[PDB]
Each structure stands twice: as structure tokens, then as C-alpha cells.
Write a protein that binds this ligand. Structure first.
Ligand SMILES: O=P(O)(O)OCCNS(=O)(=O)c1ccc(OC(F)(F)F)cc1
Ligand SMILES: O=P(O)(O)OCCNS(=O)(=O)c1ccc(OC(F)(F)F)cc1
Ligand SMILES: *Cc1c(COP(=O)(O)O)cnc(C)c1O
Ligand SMILES: *Cc1c(COP(=O)(O)O)cnc(C)c1O
Ligand SMILES: N[C@@H](Cc1c[nH]c2ccccc12)C(=O)O
Ligand SMILES: N[C@@H](Cc1c[nH]c2ccccc12)C(=O)O
Ligand SMILES: N[C@@H](Cc1c[nH]c2ccccc12)C(=O)O
Ligand SMILES: N[C@@H](Cc1c[nH]c2ccccc12)C(=O)O
Ligand SMILES: [Cl-]
Ligand SMILES: [Cl-]
Ligand SMILES: [Cl-]
Ligand SMILES: [Cl-]
Ligand SMILES: [Cl-]
Ligand SMILES: [Cl-]
Ligand SMILES: [Cl-]
Ligand SMILES: [Cl-]
Ligand SMILES: [Cs+]
Ligand SMILES: [Cs+]
Ligand SMILES: [Cs+]
Ligand SMILES: [Cs+]
Ligand SMILES: [Cs+]
Ligand SMILES: [Cs+]
Ligand SMILES: [Cs+]
Ligand SMILES: [Cs+]
Ligand SMILES: [Cs+]
Ligand SMILES: [Cs+]
Lengths: 393, 268, 393, 268
């Protein structure tokens, strides 16, 4: 029995070992209680404002759209403390951990951005943080691993399965299976078993709420479309949530196309995978013909995951949201364009969303359209990756 | 078929517990795995619990994580596992055979079709490790339509509602978890379970097998003394495979000695 | 000087040798006059009804959409005399030829469907017809060449350039350059120099006018979208025209993706070409880096052309119409599906439009959508092509 | 530069017509084409009309269609044609050089940039065969900005408005079409053109060169007698190339004989 619906149509659920069901039920009850608690909301609002720096700017980008009928705004989650939107929901989940009386945090990370976000929230709020990371990701993300350790977090390499993000997801759940009476699992995206897709959406929805207020103030109307990249689904559902009932507003999610959908070297399960059951949820998966979980690929580690949150799969199925893909090369061009024409270095994740908005403009340059891209993060972290690719060309 | 019901009736008539080893199918290869399983049976296994290698075994500790990886290094697929299961049943007509599955391998080509294939090869039960009772309906319905026992987990912190659910829905045996956490011989259960065993019998549950952390004969004896119908051991068995990869002969000798000792502990 | 605008925004024009400008001016004047002449309209309506069999059915396809919230209708141009929509506009252009006092018809053809349509209209209306066809197309289309000769038309193989459709287009204009005082050039699509894009649209617009009346009668509303394949643009603009001012109705054009856009072996210039000047028009082209006209490719000869009519390029540029592509394999699946589930053998051209509608349904099966596919032709002509591909698999 | 103006003033002082051959650049290869062009000049060509091979030459009959195809078989590109044009000008400083273009090759990398490259290599005029006066504005504007003469076509059925347009917009020479149809020696113009020639002079048009179907000395003489400043011959020249592909030496000898005879017909 649950307080909230664990499903979005056919997608979602609570596909965990029986031992973990009390942990999920406890978390759901604590969340429902917290959402009705003005003191909890006030402490969350205080952290978001005075520690993380909300509200974030909404920047009109005039140089990149000059000579077209596109008006493009960027929602500047790149300016949030930590340099990505992840900070919003780790502060909320750290407060849930404290509400339940817990002292310890478990987190998974691939790119390392969630590991750093979990570590910074834990440092601020007096929680002991341990982070699981696939050994291949540890090797690739020395800077983020060092940031996590500077903030006092334990980083535990995972050597099982493919030694990457899905393997760290598994290890975090293995640990929680034996530790949930003392530790909270701070899941890094709007995916996994109920109640995480719901919690992470509600702890990211200020992105879309601020965007709505800002665009009304500046333009006197709603956007024609809001556009966000989709790794697990958190920044996109955070931007989308407050617009879902505004039926005129397009919701466009951008999956990584990697080397191209036809190559199979991509991270686009929502449109190019198959529904499966993994990481506690029924959701579109990249998987082998016989049901093993496949290796995803993107130039951007933040998008490199073989599944997607269940609310995106549901919004797609009913036609409320549309999902597209952007290749590595399209993302790299968008990265270079924003640097040169706006003086903003975007995350390569966010560059996938920008690349699709630029395509919407360039394909139909006399179409009047008011677009918002969720600039989910800053791209300082990506300049080595971009240097190496431009060098190899 | 009624293979668990027949086994437990025969063991009850001898005042005897069941000893049930777990191994990963195709660890360390298909041919050696078939020899291992025949050795387990010859040495006194009453039933088997057999894992299909899966990319993401999130209820398993490192020993069985590494068994899955060895089977993958040998190219073992679920299709090859079902060929092995058909041949095990062709050799051994009465031993109950239980599978340890993860949900995606059951759902992949259709839940009903999965349980139909289990019936065709002569499997007796399926435990889907990442499907709790809350998500179990299509799995348990398909199991029962195909004469497969759906195996439910009774955790140590089970409340009365969960005991009644596991008791009503389950068949074959009830899995009595020793402890929280994941599979592993390095972590022994240190909670008495006789109260859960008594409540399960009161609610007419399938007979209980204790599992997780069972690595010694005294634990098998203790499970029976507490009122359980028997005990499952996986990591302790898989550790003998891992230790003896270079000597297939010594591997079978040590598996025989271990299973013999664990089965002796179940006898009246 | 012209009576009508030769451009659709930046696209179109009259890029012909000076010698041909009087031929285009004469044709434009005759068309403008004919459009105001009730006797001309009555003779055109009579031919369309009593000879060609208009109106064509609008068929609701319930088996292929079962279990989804898509309602799909097919506009049955496959049932028109000749088995394709081309018949509509050849009857109108034959009447324009007679209005100008001409006795001879010139036509280009690739797949041979326009050659047959021109030959049948010429046989009925007492015109001498000569058809230019690239020698490679003559070799591939023995059945259509024989049909053209049965109807008394002269078929002239073209050996210059790439010996295919663009080369036959050139040869038709070369002939007209020396013969327009006696011969009318019956251009086969909504492309080429003004006034052809305009004439061919107006002589195909009964497709969309009937569709609108039929869907209102059957559903009490307009479609959410109308979907048509795009070879040169005639069947698509014929379906689209009457809906252009109905801003709620999506207009979706489907270009051939061939072996895949990334292979370069496609016929999708509108979205994947470059604007150029060729065949009398400024329009998107497939062309080499240095401006030679490139070879297009599709499984379907009717879609295999390296350019597109200028009104489609314009409708795309302003965002009124959206253009997508469908690969050979997607088209073949749609062909097989319609045969098996509706008992209709569609043209492989039309199968590209159906494949995109099936994708709209399958991607978002709980989206409520009322779709019309223009079934531009019947696929009897394609059963050898389909047999050969299924055999080779 | 003023190369056409200087040529026509010099010919006027000798009461002499211009003889202007056409060839396709790089037909049958780059080296042989350069030798052909030097032979045309040495044999008495007053100016040149040079085609850039194009996939779709829709103003050309089979002879020049086949010249385009031979140049493509030799891998000739527009970039290679502009290298040839630079070298022709480096050898021959005063001969007017006109290009025969199709619109896509001019538009491809930008109209302004095309005419800037023509100025850089020392081209004097451009005729864009599929751009009528109605579409000419960006072409003629870019031509004049880069000291290139835009060449306009005066058809036999030209009305007074078209004569005034061609006269006002054109520079260098006015192309006086012999006839309807496409290029070819197999089709001779059989309409008197002296009325169009007189109207063009009345409207201060660039001097007229008659072109299409000119294959014989008597036609060159007739063009001058009718008041034209000269005559252009293409297919007749290209036929000598086509006939002599196997003997480059005989090809140059026959081109020399033909151009000599055609140029002699222009002299007072
Ligand atoms: O002896 P150990 O500690 O290795 O335990 C071996 C158990 N192997 S098994 O197939 O019974 C088994 C049973 C249940 C499992 O997870 C679940 F409880 F979540 F369902 C996992 C494995
Ligand atoms: O002697 P012919 O019959 O081969 O004529 C050769 C003419 N070669 S050209 O470059 O002057 C030339 C001039 C104009 C052309 O077409 C246009 F009039 F439409 F513009 C084509 C070629
Ligand atoms: C983590 C991350 C993402 C992808 O994760 P989502 O949960 O899909 O938002 C995107 N952008 C940036 C900058 C990130 O750090
Ligand atoms: C000719 C043809 C086409 C493509 O031509 P359009 O001018 O783009 O319509 C499409 N379908 C069929 C059946 C055809 O015969
Ligand atoms: N790999 C990214 C984002 C991320 C964290 N957890 C995830 C789970 C699924 C998908 C993406 C993620 C990071 O660790 O910063
Ligand atoms: N520490 C024991 C007993 C225990 C305490 N809390 C639990 C919660 C669930 C299961 C078991 C327990 C174990 O982890 O097994
Ligand atoms: N190739 C097809 C359709 C067609 C005719 N003329 C065209 C011009 C451009 C594009 C397509 C066409 C036919 O001849 O039947
Ligand atoms: N028959 C001649 C003269 C002619 C008649 N009608 C024409 C129209 C245009 C140009 C020339 C003509 C020719 O084709 O050249
Ligand atoms: Cl459900
Ligand atoms: Cl790095
Ligand atoms: Cl939409
Ligand atoms: Cl049984
Ligand atoms: Cl214009
Ligand atoms: Cl055929
Ligand atoms: Cl739209
Ligand atoms: Cl000059
Ligand atoms: Cs703009
Ligand atoms: Cs919209
Ligand atoms: Cs993903
Ligand atoms: Cs039972
Ligand atoms: Cs005992
Ligand atoms: Cs339906
Ligand atoms: Cs619509
Ligand atoms: Cs096309
Ligand atoms: Cs002039
Ligand atoms: Cs003379």
C-alpha cells in the first residue's frame, strides 16, 4: 500500500527486493509529510536562496538568433551553486534525511556531478556521505572525485558488471538494503523506484515555476516550447512540471544521439530502446535482445545512462511531451556557438538541448517562436573533452 | 507437477530438513556447471536454486556478482541456461528445481511466455529477486497458470499483513530471509526467526527455507531446530567454485565434502 | 512582368533561358483566364468526375490503428483513373493546351507514372504526346513505356548527363525552347519555373477540398494533421492547399530517406539539401560542394528527384508545414502492413506517408489524433520491386 | 578593364567583324583544352566564349552536351576551370574572355563571390544562360561591381520593352540569338535580324554578336553585312574536337584551318 500512485500510466513502480519496501514506504511518508510542513518548506527555500543562489537568471540570447523569428531564453541553472541544477534536489533530499532522523547519505554518480552535489549538501547539513562510482568513471573523473573528497565524502569504486553508472546504481541499492535504518539513499535523478521520480520532480519544479514567472514578466505570455536534455530526467521534469497543464506549451526532451541512432552508440532509450524492468522501475531501456542491460554512449557523461525516468515515458505515450535526439557533433557545435556568440560555456549535457533549439530556429527561420532552453549546467568541466575532440579533428 | 510438496512430505516422514544449494548456471562454463550440479545432487542436495546470469544482480553480494561475471566471460545466455535446465530435468526426475531470476529476464519476451518455458523444461519454482509482493501480481498469476511455484520473501522485519500475503500467494516454499543486505557467506544472520516460522505455519504458508549467510552445518541444524523445513546455501558453494577454478577435479571433491556435511546436519 | 507572384518568399522564380519567357508568360495568362472561365471549370469538372472518377473515397482504416488513440483515414487517390493523383492535373493542363490552341504535348517522366498520365490525357483529348525519359529509367520501367506507347505517345530516351529524371526534365525544356508555338510542356509536378508550381497546385487542390468535406461529414471536425509524400510536391500541395488557412491542421510532408540520411543515399533536399537554382527555380537541391546537381535515391522512383517544389520550401521556412523523412525499410514495412491489415496495396511513394503516420501513432499510442494520409497511388506497379527485396532478405 | 570596348574600337577602325569561338573548358582534358584555346587565338579568334562544365546545360544541343560530358570524364571542376582562366589571361593580356555559365554554378558559393573570382582571374564577361532579364538583377549588379560585363540575350521574337532592357542593362556585347531552340550547328537561323540590330544601336546597346547555328564563313560575312559587330561559333568548333579525339595534332590543324577561314570572312 502507498500514499501516492507509484505509476505514470504503465511506467514506474517499486521493483526492489522485498527487504527495501519499508525504506521506500518510510521515504514516501516523510516526503508527503514534508510537503505539508511550512517549516520544512521554509528551510528548503532558505537553503535554495541564501546557499544555492535562487532564483537563477533567465537570459535572452539575441546574438545566436539574429535574423530569425526565434526568441531564445536560457534558464541559467549553470549559475546555481555547484554549477548544475542537481543542487536543488540534493538540498531537499538532505532535509528529508534529517526529517527521518538519519545521519548518513548514500549516492551513486557517473559523471561525478551528483556525487559532488550530494557531498556539498552533506557537508553543509552535517551528514556523512558515501558515494558509489563505477571504477571506469572514477578513472575518467579525477577532478570530481577530488572535489567529493575535499568535501569530506567517501568515494567507493564499483568493479562489478560494466564498472559504470548502472553498476554504481546497483551498489547504492545493495548498501541501502543493509543500512536504510541509518542511511538515506540520495538518488541522483527522476528515476528509480517510487517515490524517487515524484520526489525529484517536486524538488526540481522551481526551475519551471521561476521560468514561467520570468517569461510572463519579460514577454507577457508563455513560451511556445521549453527544451531540456534528458539523462535520467530530473532537469527536464523540473522545467516541464509547472507547464504540464498549460496545453499550448511544447515540452521537448532531448536524448543523446551519441555517434548517431543508427550506430547503436547512443543514450536514447525513450525513443530507441525497449520497455524493461531495472533500477526499481518499468521504463524504456537499452537492452540486448535477451534482456541484459546494454551499454549507453554519449560524449556527455551526464547523459550516458541506458534508461530514463518513468514520467517522461508516460508524457511521451500520451503525446504531452515530444522527445528527440541530438548527436555528439550537433552538441559540440552548440557548445562552440554559445561560447563565441553569448560568452556562456554550457555543459555538454545542456548543449544537447541548445542544439535542438538551434535546429528548430535554423530549419524554419521565419517561424515565430518563443523558446526556453534549460541550461542545466556550466561547461568548465567539459573544456578538456572539447579540447581533445577539436585537437583530434 | 508437485515436486516440492512430494519432497517436503518425504522429508517430514524422516523428520528431516532440506538442504538446498544455489549456483549460477554456466559458472564457470556450461560443461563444468552441469558436472557441479550433478555432484551437488549426488552429495545429497534435496532441491536446487539456480541463477540465470544477469547484468545487474542487485540482491547479490560480491561472491555471486563474480559467479555471474564468470558465466558471462564463458558467453552464457538465458537460452543456454534453459537448455541446461531441460538436460538437468532429463537426468533427475524428482528433485525440485527453483530459478533465481531478475525481473527484466522474466519480462523481456513476455511474462506468460517465460513461465511457459519454465514449465516446458520442468522447472518447479521461480523467485524474482527484485519483484516485491506489491508488484507480484502478473508474475504469480503466470507462475500458477504454468504449474510453477512463485517464491515469496519473508524478511526478518515482516509485519502481520506481509506474513499473511506471503502465506496466501506463495507456493512450493516460503523464502525466510536470515537478515537484511545481500547474498554472502561473510555476513551471518543474528536474529531468531522461530516467531516468523510459527506465524507462517499458522497462516498455512508453503514450508520455510532459511536463506542468506548459511555457510556451516550448525546453521542448517539450527534452521531445522527453529521449525524451518530446511536451508539454502549459495555463496559458500560458489566460493568453492571460485577457489578451485584451476582444478576441476578438486572443485568437485570439495563441493561433494561440503554438501555431504551440510546435508548430514539436516538429518534427525 | 507577370500577373501572379512567381515566388513563395525567396523560393521559385523563372530561371529559364530568355527564349522561353514568352512561353511561360503565355501559359500564365491562359491559366489566369481559365481560372475565371466557368466553361473551362465545367469541362475540367466533367473530366474529373465522368472520366477520372472523382470524388475519391476517404477510407477509415480501423485494423491498423486498433488499441491506439489514432484515427487514420486514407484519401484514396489510388482509385483515380490511372492509379495515381497525377491524372487530376494532366487533365487540367491538357485543357490549358487546347485553350491556347495547341495540338502537341511534351512531358518528362522518371518512374513513368507522369508519362502514362500525360499519354492518357492526350489520347482522350486529341493531342500528340511526346515523352522524354532518361535511358536508365526507360530500361527500369518497361511496363510504363509499353503503356505510354499503347496510348499512342512517342517515348524518347535521354542519354545526356546522368540519363535519369533531371536529364529528361532538361530535354523537355530544350524541346519546348524550339517548339512552344505548337507544343505545351506538361510538367509533371508542383516544381519548375513559374507558373507551374501554382498551376499544378490549383489543378490538384480538389484532393484537400474533398478531404475537408469528407472528414467534416464523418468526424464533424478538421484533421489534426494531413500527411503526404514529397517527390516534386504535387500530391502533397494538392492535399495541403485547402488547409493552409486552417492554422490548427498540421501539414506534414514526407521526403524519401532512402538508405538513411547519414548515408547520403536519399531524396530529401528540403531538410538535407542546399538552396540552388535548377529546373527553372530557386529551391532546395541535392548538389555537390561545387554546385553540380547530385544523384538522389529512393526505393520509390516516384520520389527519386534531387529537388522539391518551391511552395514546400516556403511553407517549411515560415513553420506552416513540417517535413520529415522515411527510409526504404520504413516504407516497405508500411506497404506490407496496409496489404495485410486493410487489403489495400499502396504505391511505395504513398507508403512513405503511411509509414510516418504509423510512427506518429506507435511513438505516442495514447495521444488522441485524427490523421489523414494522402494515398497518392496504388502499388500494383511495385510488387516486382517488393518481391525482389523480400527475396534478397 | 575595357577589353570588349577596346576590341570593338580597333575592329571598327579596320571596318572588321569579330569572330568568337566557343569551347568547353577542359574538353577533352585540361592540357589539350589549353592547347586548343591557344590555337584558336593564334588562328585569329578576336574573343573567346568559354563554358564551365555543368551537370545540366539546358540551353545546349547534343554537341555541347557531349563536350560537357567529356570534360566531366576528365574530372574537370569549376575550380580547375578558374585555374585555366588565370593561365589563359597570363598568356594573352587583351583578348576579351567571356564565360558561359549556368545559374547554379554562379549562385553556389555566393553570386558576389563568383564575380569577384572572375575579376581576380581577368574574365571580361559572364552570360548566365538560364537567367532571363526578369531574374537578372543580382547577377548584373554583382557583375558591374566587379568590372564584369553582364551579357544579355536578344531573341528573334524580342519586343520593344525587351530590346530597351537588354540595351540598358547589358555591357561588353549583346548576344543576338539566331533562332529559337538550343546550341547546334545542325540548325541554321533563317530569320533576318537587321531590324533588331538597328533597334539595339538606336537604344545604345553593347555591340551585337550573332550566335547559334553559325558554322560557315558565309554566315560570319552575313552577320557583319546585317550590321552585327561579329559572330560566335561553338558546336562547329566542338565538332572538330569530337571528330579528332584520337589525333590531337590533326585536331589542332583542323581547328586552325576552320578558325582562319571563319576569321577571314569577318575582314573588310
Ligand atoms: O548463501 P547466500 O548468502 O549466498 O544466499 C544465497 C541465496 N541465493 S538464492 O537464490 O536463494 C536468493 C534468494 C533471494 C535473493 O534476493 C531476494 F531476497 F531479494 F529475493 C537472492 C538470492
Ligand atoms: O554555334 P552554336 O549553335 O553551338 O552556339 C554556341 C553558343 N555558345 S555560347 O556560349 O555563345 C551560348 C550562348 C547562349 C546560350 O544560351 C542562352 F541563349 F540561353 F543563353 C548558350 C550558349
Ligand atoms: C546531471 C546532469 C544532467 C542530466 O541529468 P538529468 O537528471 O537528466 O537532469 C544534465 N545536465 C547537467 C548539467 C547535469 O549535471
Ligand atoms: C508521381 C507520384 C508521386 C510523387 O510526385 P509528387 O509530385 O510529389 O506528388 C507520389 N505518389 C505517386 C503515387 C506518384 O505517382
Ligand atoms: N551521471 C551523472 C547524472 C546521474 C546521476 N545519477 C544518475 C542516474 C541515471 C542517469 C543519470 C544520472 C552524475 O553522476 O552526475
Ligand atoms: N541487524 C540485523 C537485524 C535487523 C535490524 N534491522 C533490520 C531491518 C530489516 C531486516 C533485519 C534487520 C540485520 O541487518 O539483518
Ligand atoms: N518520376 C515520377 C514523378 C515525376 C514526374 N516529373 C517529376 C519531376 C520532379 C519530381 C518528380 C517527378 C514520374 O515520372 O511519374
Ligand atoms: N522558326 C524560326 C523563327 C521563329 C518562329 N517563331 C519563333 C519564336 C521565337 C524565336 C524564333 C522564332 C526559329 O525557330 O528560330
Ligand atoms: Cl500499473
Ligand atoms: Cl575530466
Ligand atoms: Cl506537439
Ligand atoms: Cl511443487
Ligand atoms: Cl524574390
Ligand atoms: Cl517495373
Ligand atoms: Cl507544427
Ligand atoms: Cl570590356
Ligand atoms: Cs531574433
Ligand atoms: Cs506550441
Ligand atoms: Cs539516457
Ligand atoms: Cs500457500
Ligand atoms: Cs540435526
Ligand atoms: Cs483507434
Ligand atoms: Cs495539430
Ligand atoms: Cs525529392
Ligand atoms: Cs549599354
Ligand atoms: Cs566580308
Amino acid at each position: 500500500t502507498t500514499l501516492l500512485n507509484p505509476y505514470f500510466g504503465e511506467f514506474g513502480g517499486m521493483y526492489v527486493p522485498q527487504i527495501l519496501m519499508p525504506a521506500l514506504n518510510q521515504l514516501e511518508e516523510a516526503f508527503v509529510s514534508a510537503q505539508k510542513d511550512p517549516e520544512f518548506q521554509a528551510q528548503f527555500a532558505d537553503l535554495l536562496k541564501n546557499y544555492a543562489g535562487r532564483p537563477t537568471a533567465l537570459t535572452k540570447c539575441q546574438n545566436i538568433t539574429a535574423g530569425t523569428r526565434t526568441t531564445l531564453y536560457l534558464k541559467r541553472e549553470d549559475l546555481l551553486h555547484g554549477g548544475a541544477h542537481k543542487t536543488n534536489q540534493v538540498l531537499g533530499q538532505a532535509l528529508l534525511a534529517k526529517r527521518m532522523g538519519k545521519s548518513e547519505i548514500i549516492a551513486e554518480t557517473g559523471a561525478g556531478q551528483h556525487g559532488v552535489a550530494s557531498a556539498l549538501a552533506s557537508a553543509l547539513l552535517g551528514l556523512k556521505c558515501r558515494i558509489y562510482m563505477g571504477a571506469k568513471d572514477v578513472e575518467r573523473q579525477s577532478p570530481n572525485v577530488f572535489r567529493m573528497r575535499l568535501m569530506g565524502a567517501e568515494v567507493i569504486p564499483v568493479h562489478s558488471g560494466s564498472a559504470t553508472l548502472k553498476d554504481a546504481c546497483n551498489e547504492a541499492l545493495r548498501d541501502w538494503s543493509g543500512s536504510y535504518e541509518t542511511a538515506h539513499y540520495m538518488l541522483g535523478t527522476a528515476a528509480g523506484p517510487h517515490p524517487y521520480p515524484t520526489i525529484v520532480r517536486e524538488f526540481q519544479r522551481m526551475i519551471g515555476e521561476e521560468t514561467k514567472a520570468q517569461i510572463l514578466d519579460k514577454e507577457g505570455r508563455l513560451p511556445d516550447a521549453v527544451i531540456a536534455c534528458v539523462g535520467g530526467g530530473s532537469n527536464a521534469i523540473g522545467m516541464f512540471a509547472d507547464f504540464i497543464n498549460d496545453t499550448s506549451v511544447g515540452l521537448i526532451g532531448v536524448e543523446p544521439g551519441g555517434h548517431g541512432i543508427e550506430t547503436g552508440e547512443h543514450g536514447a532509450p525513450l525513443k530507441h530502446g525497449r520497455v524493461g524492468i531495472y533500477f526499481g522501475m518499468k521504463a524504456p531501456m537499452m537492452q540486448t535482445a535477451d534482456g541484459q542491460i546494454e551499454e549507453s554512449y554519449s560524449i556527455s557523461a551526464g547523459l550516458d545512462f541506458p534508461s530514463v525516468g518513468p514520467q517522461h515515458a508516460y508524457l511521451n505515450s500520451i503525446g504531452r511531451a515530444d522527445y528527440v535526439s541530438i548527436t555528439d557533433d550537433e552538441a559540440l557545435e552548440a557548445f562552440k556557438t554559445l561560447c563565441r556568440h553569448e560568452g556562456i560555456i554550457p555543459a555538454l549535457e545542456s548543449s544537447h538541448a541548445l542544439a535542438h533549439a538551434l535546429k528548430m530556429m535554423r530549419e524554419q527561420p521565419e517561424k515565430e517562436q518563443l523558446l526556453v532552453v534549460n541550461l542545466s549546467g556550466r561547461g568548465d568541466k567539459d573544456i578538456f573533452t572539447v579540447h581533445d575532440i577539436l585537437k583530434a579533428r | 507437477m508437485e515436486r516440492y510438496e512430494n519432497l517436503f512430505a518425504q522429508l517430514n516422514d524422516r523428520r528431516e530438513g532440506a538442504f538446498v544449494p544455489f549456483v549460477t548456471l554456466g559458472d564457470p562454463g556450461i560443461e563444468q556447471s552441469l558436472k557441479i550440479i550433478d555432484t551437488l545432487i549426488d552429495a545429497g542436495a534435496d532441491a536446487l536454486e539456480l541463477g540465470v546470469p544477469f547484468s545487474d544482480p542487485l540482491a547479490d553480494g560480491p561472491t555471486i556478482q563474480n559467479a555471474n561475471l564468470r558465466a558471462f566471460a564463458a558467453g552464457v545466455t538465458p537460452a543456454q541456461c534453459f537448455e541446461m535446465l531441460a538436460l538437468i530435468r532429463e537426468k533427475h526426475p524428482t528433485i525440485p528445481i527453483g530459478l533465481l531470476m531478475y525481473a527484466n529476464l522474466v519480462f523481456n519476451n513476455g511474462i506468460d511466455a517465460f513461465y511457459a518455458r519454465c514449465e516446458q523444461v520442468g522447472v518447479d519454482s521461480v523467485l524474482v529477486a527484485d519483484v516485491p509482493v506489491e508488484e507480484s501480481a502478473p508474475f504469480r498469476q503466470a507462475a500458477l497458470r504454468h504449474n510453477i511455484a512463485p517464491i515469496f520473501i519473508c524478511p526478518p522485519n515482516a509485519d502481520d499483513d506481509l506474513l499473511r500475503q506471503v502465506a496466501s500467494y506463495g507456493r512450493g516454499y516460503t523464502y525466510l530471509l536470515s537478515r537484511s543486505g545481500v547474498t554472502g557467506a561473510e555476513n551471518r544472520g543474528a536474529l531468531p526467526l522461530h516467531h516468523l516460522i510459527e506465524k507462517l505455519k499458522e497462516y498455512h504458508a508453503a514450508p520455510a527455507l532459511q536463506g542468506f549467510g548459511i555457510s556451516s552445518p550448525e546453521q542448517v541444524s539450527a534452521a531445522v531446530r527453529a521449525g524451518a523445513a530446511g536451508a539454502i546455501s549459495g555463496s559458500a558453494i560458489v566460493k568453492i567454485i571460485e577457489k578451485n577454478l584451476a582444478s576441476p577435479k578438486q572443485m568437485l571433491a570439495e563441493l561433494r565434502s561440503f554438501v555431504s556435511a551440510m546435508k548430514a546436519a539436516s538429518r534427525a
